[PDB]
């Protein structure tokens, strides 16, 4: 199994929720489990990141 | 500064290369 910060292409069958913002939540992005306030950001990621 | 374009998990054990030219300019080669 390749584990990297690059875009994932194989995933387990976990159902995606909606996205909730400006509120404290227990998130998981492609297996990236954490906890925090998700909010829209002016950080212009390059298209490969 | 050069961003990525491509990655190939293609398993070649490389030692050599060349460019290709189109006909009916200059190029430069360095090492890492
Ligand atoms: C990768 O391919 C090369 C051939 O293209 C293999 O051979 C090279 O390395 C060997 C290491 O023992 C040398 O014995 C060979 O003389 C050498 N050949 C050339 C032309 O450079 C190499 O073994 C391959 N890699 C692995 C890990 O086996």
Swiss-Prot record, chain A:
Residues covered by region (Disordered): 5-27
Domain of life: Viruses
Function: Attaches the virion to the cell membrane by interacting with host receptor, initiating the infection. The major receptor is host ACE2. When S2/S2' has been cleaved, binding to the receptor triggers direct fusion at the cell membrane. When S2/S2' has not been cleaved, binding to the receptor results in internalization of the virus by endocytosis using host TFRC and GRM2 and leading to fusion of the virion membrane with the host endosomal membrane. Alternatively, may use NRP1/NRP2 and integrin as entry receptors.
Subunit details: Binds to host ACE2. RBD also interacts with the N-linked glycan on 'Asn-90' of ACE2. Cleavage of S generates a polybasic C-terminal sequence on S1 that binds to host Neuropilin-1 (NRP1) and Neuropilin-2 (NRP2) receptors. Interacts with host integrin alpha-5/beta-1 (ITGA5:ITGB1) and with ACE2 in complex with integrin alpha-5/beta-1 (ITGA5:ITGB1). May interact via cytoplasmic c-terminus with M protein. May interact (via N-terminus) with host bilirubin and biliverdin, thereby preventing antibody binding to the SARS-CoV-2 spike NTD via an allosteric mechanism.
Name by which UniProt lists this protein: Spike protein S1
The organism of origin for this protein: Severe acute respiratory syndrome coronavirus 2
Gene: S
Complete-protein stretch covered: 515 to 563 of 1273
């Amino acid at each position: 199994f390749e584990l990297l910060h690059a875009p994932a292409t194989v995933c387990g069958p976990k159902k995606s929720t909606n996205l909730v913002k400006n509120k404290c939540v227990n998130f998981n992005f492609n297996g990236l489990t954490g906890t925090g306030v998700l909010t829209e950001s002016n950080k212009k990621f390059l298209p490969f990141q | 500064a050069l961003e990525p374009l491509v990655d190939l998990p293609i398993g070649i054990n490389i030692t050599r290369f060349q460019t290709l030219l189109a006909l009916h300019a200059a190029y430069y080669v360095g090492y890492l």
